[model samples]
Target chain A: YKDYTGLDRTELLSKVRHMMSDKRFNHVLGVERAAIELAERYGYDKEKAGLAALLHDYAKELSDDEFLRLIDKYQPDPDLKKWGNNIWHGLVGIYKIQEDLAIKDQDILAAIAKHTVGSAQMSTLDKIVYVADYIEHNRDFPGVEEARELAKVDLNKAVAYETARTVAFLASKAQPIYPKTIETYNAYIPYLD
Target chain B: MTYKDYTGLDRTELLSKVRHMMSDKRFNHVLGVERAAIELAERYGYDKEKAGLAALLHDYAKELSDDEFLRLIDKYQPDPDLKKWGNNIWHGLVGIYKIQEDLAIKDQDILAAIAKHTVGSAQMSTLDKIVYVADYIEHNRDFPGVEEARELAKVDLNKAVAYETARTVAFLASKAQPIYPKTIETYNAYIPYL
Candidate 1:
């Protein structure tokens, strides 16, 4: 176990309240609650799930300049800059959450990074956070209800659904996706059976 | 090839030029796409002339050597990011410039359709979508969902795009092909319409 098990509810709420919009804050709370339930169902640590969900969107509201400046500062990867804000908030935001919140747990950082577009070989915690974000109570999309139901019984099935659904939903809007998004879908698709 | 001769090449001349350039086997594939595109255009209410031209020229540069394609990229400079991809992507994207410069094609619809025929796009024009579907289902393509794709292409264009994108991505995944970003972009763009 890591030194940091989780965050105090009050501390997390206070920081999240200042960091995100009221609507997003509500979504984060929803994800946190949902992730905890998933963690319990899947035999992961509730504390790890709670912390991962709370911090997933910590940098989602940062300005583009902030992301750029942070990108320059961290020098994470040259490819990171090509992605837009929707993608950066999860990927590049890894550096910020660590620097700003002092959250150094690798599992939590990975969960935050993988939360938005998922990856091929996600850990149980990674899947929990990723699925929680998609099927969070506040999200009202076409197949989210079915996704949430799938998450209850089979986490892998839910991840597969979200992976396919994310691309489908984005394509319907004619929106661009990050390259890794497809890589993640490719990685996990075979296990869908 | 004379530049002057290319500018005024009729459809037959165009076919002859491609035939002169391609292997017997590859030329046959272009013929297949041309046939399929014309049939699709008839059923989908698209311009048959444009679909035929676009499909015939879609793979005009498919066999270009790496050196040749790289030199063309330098001359055309279509998209800077195009340099990152290889022949599979270059044939459809960078190859459009060759068709325009060498073949003197000025039709933007034909040019754009040829450009997107390989990976497809989010906002595909009618001809673009037609060529994309036609290229995928043109008698030579063999894959698991091909029959379903051909069936879907007949009725619902968007569904066909979705079906082809999914199957191609899965195949790419299985073989571990170094997929281009635009291919993923196309998949991301069309999967929802299915």
Candidate 2:
């Protein structure tokens, strides 16, 4: 439908179900619903939003064996090492969307790439993917309500603040924040003026 | 563009902001600094016009008359202590604030480059370090450490950073100037390496 390639509603879901399998099917549905809801709220394209959000985490569950194989073949960033869940999932997901899936929309690829850590100067689709990932009704986190409000008004600022908050929380507890995360955070956080 | 082309960036209004942020002659020094910084940045690989623009506008708050540099930065703020007794240190951050609220220039990298130019941020831009060091060791400068620092500026940048920082720290100590911990910390951070 909205978030898929030129495919209609039936073809879209069939692929989503087939690729993600029964294991990932439930979360995919939540992402799809959330994307459409956010698209309507923020006046973004519902189809692209839904498809991107639905497919965003599609490749999250790939085995370490499979990831190591596919990852080196694609040559994803080496900064991915030691970054844990945050790095590999979005990263592998991005690869699947591009080289594997052969999905050729630049905007859609960007939405998938930046969904995990919001990028600076993001488009409406990028923001939609990011917020829908965080704000889906099924998803819950501390201060989720605040994120929803800031996302509605100033997407960039909200992304900055949320990223800062995430980084700060990780830091206070002596967690490892990847160098790439720091760079990404610096690009958007404090949101200039 | 030249200042003539940089209209609405009125020198008078800029001066007013300068006056609010620093002292009278400080504005003139910033003008001199513009000449020095532009020339310095030009010699390096960076954009000369942009360097001049930032240099001319660097100390936008270095000429404030009152203790209250801005309504947002009330006199009760910590800068009041630094204002009196000719210790104009610690105002590097105010330059960042006024550059945006007063000048409405919102380039984050440029703003940050100017903000921590004096104290020297670890994340400092190339243009930033150049302006701060150039201001210290310009052609007209006859300070004790000027020649060596200038030579080092042309050669080893970190060595220059170390030398300039040591000289500033020493001068501040001698003059009873406000030696901000950030300055000492930044200086110490770089000095040991060289």
Candidate 3:
């Protein structure tokens, strides 16, 4: 639980900016800021929320070539493509965040891994990641409006509904969906009424 | 030595590839898949011999590294995830790729069976059912519902696929693991057909 506010936001963003390009770094900052808002909404730890959101897309700018190289190298657990990178970013990022950036918090990494696709029994940080990404400044999908509506009414419902929609959408695209989203969706759907 | 030449190779040759590609436990799974594929192909009247061969070699590349997997995906430019995350269980995706990319074989039925081997598709062919059941029933799988699936496979394959899919979904839920969106989507797609 390092205090990110004590550290220079410029320096932090600078490192992240290097990992990602300027534009993506801005997105990371935006997510971090939005995560703060969502954390407040969901009664989560805002600093952790900001960290997970800020670093969620840390490797978003890595060359597709690097990603391909990694997947072939690890023979990772299948369904690694759920992140839409088509490159095993979830597991790979977990390793990189720990090994490279030296982010040791398991909760942070767990949140990041399960963030994009989501899973059952997600932690507060996990929900924060998914929620932040959905309501982040960049998001503008058709459902975003209703999602915002739902977000206002119920934080958990928004997470559940968005998770199902994200998983179903990816599945329809034939994208690799994380097993977690299914866990969340199937569990949520049965009792939604 | 490689599975690219699997088709031209004989049964012993295919089994040899299976032996080399898998761990001891997964090797047994190959045998299960081989037998399961045969049963389904026999029932649906597809090419049993080829189905068995495909099932046996379905995971030929399971042992490769993520880096190496990507190297090949790039060399082949398969659907991106085939190299990305899906590359983890890419044996099926790459299994299909091996059949076509290598030009060392020409067996679409066997290839597609291998492609959809994991997280099965909505409309599973007999070959698909075979490969999937083979992996599930392969003696090494000791999951909670595997026994019933193994039992039902003997009685009926359609029931087996449905049973397997449902069980897979439920079991995954139990583990709190992420479900491949394709899985839920696949389930919904097959619902009407069921």
Candidate 4:
């Protein structure tokens, strides 16, 4: 029912639904639901949280070539070129969301950009989207229960817990961690105690 | 022993000074690292004396107080974030200043080897690798896979580096511990070998 994105909820959901697979669209809705709840708890703008969460993964299904073409046009951080879709969906995907959705709010865009690999600095909106995407109802990871509880009580503690677990999981799998993720870990881990 | 004379002290005098700096346990560990470093140098055809000296003096700052480390950070300003970490990281990084000032060892390669022994770097030199692997597989280190690491060091140093990097990262991550970024960089840089 909110109009922050210049589109009503139905119109925005329609476009996002068209862009994503059924499973992904469901995931997005779950994220939006979670974001709205966090926005209410943290005294953030619920409408803006919903709008950003709705379109957060707007470019998730882009072809590798399409992502590369967008990368060429936008000329983002050169380090981005070396990463694959696991990274591209957030960092490079923002441009696609801008062009297709006609949404130009920097806060919304930054929330989307930082949702995948968190940044050292984040606003409350960013934290909402980031934590929502992790502890959404459909997600069943090992630590999701604790994360959901932390999100309810202290948003910052949730961020710290999620970043620590994420990096630890990635390192355990021998996955290449984006440096910014480590920066985010270092920035937030002070809140752990 | 070939007398390259880098530290300006004979082995006896150097041992005496280093022995006074730490408890008996840590001093014995230092001696173990020296033996391992020298053996690795001999196996890999590097300078044994330099390896020994570097390994012997690597932990010179391990016993310093938090106040002392903070003072060193204030004076040297090695890294802007150095104060954020504790002695586990400081002993190798900030420890170098003390090693240079007190031991009077001016060889950059040896200094670099000592500097990087704890948190391995991406582009490690041969001496650097020797000290690092020696510290991990030193006789006093009784961890799992240490024997395999020692075996790898004897045959292929790169593989040993890869093994140690992977294992260290996994161990730290499993404990939910904060790891220095360079440690992961070292893992990514050397992981391809294995």
Candidate 5:
């Protein structure tokens, strides 16, 4: 239904399905559905939202070597090497999506890069993809329903709430936070006051 | 008010000058910070005298009115963006400049420790980290978690910094006030992400 000129959704979906596990494939579908609905409510092009959602996780299951090699080839930011798969899939994964899928729209690419660790400066489209990935139908975590309800009326608050919760939750586990995650939390969480 | 090493030299005069600038109530906390910093310096192998001097003068400008602080900021121009922050940042940040120009205490390491003690810095020397942790765990701190911080300071110096950074950051987040980004940078330095 979306006019993705460079990408054939059916072919891309089939292609990505081969790359990712069934579980990740289903998660992306859920993200796509959630994004389309939210984008419609927030007045973004529903088709563009859907395209971004479908592409957001397309590289989640790529080999770690591919991410490193592409990052080297693209020369995005050398700091990306310090991070592992948990982070790289979102940060450098966009490069892979662009090269292979030919999805070169800057907005879509930015949203994809930002979808994993939300940034301090986020466009509405960025927020849509970020929130959809967090509160997608299949996601199961404490306060999921509250986040789902909050996202309906206020999108920024939802993003703020999610970042605060994520930062705290990660800290509780004594995990090393990605620097960008810290930057995002610092920027958005304060507005919640 | 010239830059004296103060490491093994006489500090009685310097202490008196600092006390003259603050009230008895404020001076008492500075004394506590001085004592705590010295003790930490002993444990961490930094010079006790340098630690004491840095601690005593860390809050040199705490007593200034907002307009006064702003006037000084205009004169010093340490960092223009610093004007955006309130007294919490300026006292340690701007106070360093005041101490140098007027008091002539220009020891770079000592001044750097004073500049960092309030919000902490990502790159903290042993002296800087000791003074920062000391200010929080000083005997007079008397906050709910002071007991644990004090105990942690005895067991481990770096761990105490980590605990204090984490606790302060969590408290600020709960209040929804934008924490100074430098504070977060300090936390990042001491507390590793898993």
Candidate 6:
């Protein structure tokens, strides 16, 4: 952990635990467990994967007002105002992670940024954290078994599978998909067929 | 030319061209839309010839194979996300280019109406509204609320548009299917009129 960031494993876990609720921290732990396994399987650095997983939801519990303020300061994109925490926690949440966690690794930061509502282009670390968050031990959604099965053998296929499921779920609910999610759907759906 | 030649072709000539592009069933539906559109145009004081021409040529590309649509999408690059959709959507949005190139129909209003006939846009012209509502309430279209849509078409075109947009969205949601984004945009835009 010190090689990746200034804090060691104990310090990093303590900080992440302090920032989120007990339930959310449990989810974070599940994500960390899955991320590390995926990293080992996919030949990514386990320490970096674990660090990114723990900090992925660091800004999940922030108030709407705090997120809005960060949006003003960061001004990431003009369309940011249309979405709420469901999207902000991943896209805008990176700034809070930087300010609070004092971590500056671009790969880790990018993994956190794209952990929710993935982008068209994703790195291997991004795929690991994203897939882990969806198929963690605590996740018992309808398609978790298939997602977990695909994650074991092929990582890219897993990303495509998870993205199609997510898009279908959102569309069934008649929710407005963020533009990037559509781009990601188009970019990765070829792998599904 | 018994009626005004809007597309620079007599009614028989245009009908023959459009008929060769689709099945007999689809050609019958196109004829029904033309009749419905002409009636609506007469009632609303729009150009009957333009409405008939637009409706006649609206579904020309509906029967094209998926490979053909995909090839056209690759060549034209109409929308980055167009390839994600199937014939149900591709026939309207991406088919307009085929209509222009093959049929030599250069009228923007007719092409725009065809482009919007399936998933409507936030902004629509009167002709756009005519072709869209006509496609829904045409004689062959027999859905649950289609009679009400036809009645609304007679009394209030905006209300008909609103009804069709809302029902299409609700139906898509009920099926748990993916909806084009513009369909939602049309729903939001027209719901206020209801």
- Relative to the true structure, how large is the alpha-carbon lDDT of every model? 0.81, 0.64, 0.67, 0.86, 0.79, 0.84
Kindly list the per-residue Cα lDDT of model 1 for residues A153-173, writing each as its tens digit: 899878877777776665444
Q: Candidate 5 lDDT, tens digit per residue, B25-72?
A: 888899899899989989888888778888888877777677877888
Per-residue lDDT of B95 in model 1: 85
Instruction: Pick the TM-score winner.
Output: 4
Per-model C-alpha RMSD: 9.5, 15.1, 16.2, 2.3, 3.3, 4.9
lDDT of 1 by residue, B42-149 (tens): 999987877888888889998888778888888878556677678888888888877776787777888888888888887888898889999889998787768988
**TM-score, predicted candidate 1 vs. hidden true structure:** 0.59
Among the numbered candidates, top lDDT falls to 4
Each model's DockQ score: 0.12, 0.01, 0.05, 0.39, 0.31, 0.08
Ranking by DockQ: 4, 5, 1, 6, 3, 2
lDDT of each residue in B1-194, candidate 2, tens digit only: 54324435665565565566566566667767777777677677777766766776777755544444544355334555444333154355664665566665766656666777777755456787777776776555676757878788887666677777666655543322334545645564565446
How well does candidate 4 match the true structure in TM-score terms? 0.92
Better of 3 and 4 by DockQ: 4
Give me the runs in candidate 1 sitting further than 4 Å from their true place. A1-7, B1-32, B35-182, B185-194
Error of 4 at B64 (Å): 1.3
- Number of clashes in model 4? 0
What's the TM-score of each model vs. the native?
Answer: 0.59, 0.48, 0.50, 0.92, 0.86, 0.77
Candidate 5 residue lDDT tens string, A1-193:
3356355677877877877898999999999999998998899988878888988887788887888897889866767787778788877888787767756688888898888788889999999999999899999996577779878988888888787777666554445567777778877875577
CA error at residue B166 for candidate 3, angstroms: 1.9
Which parts of model 2 are misplaced by more than 4 Å?
A2-7, A18-24, A99-102, A187-193, B1-194
| Native contacts kept, each candidate | 0.12, 0.00, 0.07, 0.26, 0.23, 0.00
Model 4 Cα shift for residue A87 (angstroms):
1.2
Q: Count the backbone clashes (under 3 Å) in each candidate.
A: 0, 15, 28, 0, 5, 0
Say which candidate scores most in DockQ. 4
- Give candidate 4's error at residue A4 in angstroms: 3.4
Any runs in candidate 4 off by more than 4 Å, and if so which? Answer: B1-4, B77-80, B145-148, B151-155, B173-176
Error of 3 at B7 (Å): 1.3
DockQ of 6: 0.08
